[PDB]
Write a protein that binds this ligand. Sequence first.
Ligand SMILES: N[C@H](CCC[C@H](N)C(=O)O)C(=O)O
Ligand SMILES: N[C@H](CCC[C@H](N)C(=O)O)C(=O)O
Lengths: 121, 122
Amino acid sequence: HMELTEDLNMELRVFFDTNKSNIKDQYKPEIAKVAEKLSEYPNATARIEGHTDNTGPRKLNERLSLARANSVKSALVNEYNVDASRLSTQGFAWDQPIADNKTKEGRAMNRRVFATITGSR
Amino acid sequence: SHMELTEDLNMELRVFFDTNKSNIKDQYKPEIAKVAEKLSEYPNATARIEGHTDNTGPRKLNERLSLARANSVKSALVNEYNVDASRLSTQGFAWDQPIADNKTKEGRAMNRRVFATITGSR
Ligand SMILES: N[C@H](CCC[C@H](N)C(=O)O)C(=O)O
Ligand SMILES: N[C@H](CCC[C@H](N)C(=O)O)C(=O)O
């Protein structure tokens, strides 16, 4: 006898322009690959978390962070027919920076969605 | 790039043997083939193959036979499936690691085994 499992772990990082929550063209191949693996691992789920740099009104950044996570989700749901209930979204506004908000470069890093996908088969 | 993707494989194989024998019996061949299939789909995976005996008969016979059983499973992957030999370790433990009661025929049959763990990622 023989038993086997395969475990999926994926991290997707999507970055955004100031004030924007669109998915730039360059990320579309990475979203396609996430969709492919959610089909290959049908029990898989994703936790999609969106973020802003620390500029502009708090209320703007609460919305924009969630809008960025939702744009990612929407791309999977609408363009790849991924079931919505497998993908959670949350926005964290500026509360979890990964880089220096003092520089243009650190702010571009903070304007992001990180999605973690896990599954097994 | 903007994505990290890992798929981890964990697979367990159990093969059991007739007394004094290290040949692979036919009923085990579909499983060994499925192991070779995954070692191909995960070309970085390796296998730890461990052979064992029941506690009957001379000590050195069991030392040799336990490693012979582990080597016979390795030999099937290497020779029939062209798995790279350096990816597979073999080790015999004679009767030192029983999984069943050596006082019965059925327990002795469970101890005459090779257990292999195959792990890796792609
Ligand atoms: N011009 C805008 C930039 C804010 C949006 C920013 N926090 C982002 O993450 O894209 C302002 O400073 O009010
Ligand atoms: N009839 C042999 C059997 C010994 C090998 C046995 N320990 C095995 O694991 O196959 C003897 O008693 O010397």
